[PDB]
């Protein structure tokens, strides 16, 4: 759940 | 600036 949030949140650090 | 923000933001979500 929230790793998952986490996860997410990391690749879009790394998109942008 | 702000890439140096983002950088660090996202080292942060690596570790834990």
């Known amino acids: 759940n929230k790793?998952?949030?986490k996860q997410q949140?990391?690749?879009l650090?790394?998109?942008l």
Do not use: D, S, T
């Open 3 to 5: 790793k998952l949030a």
């Open 9 to 11: 949140l990391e690749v």
């Open 13 to 15: 650090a790394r998109y």
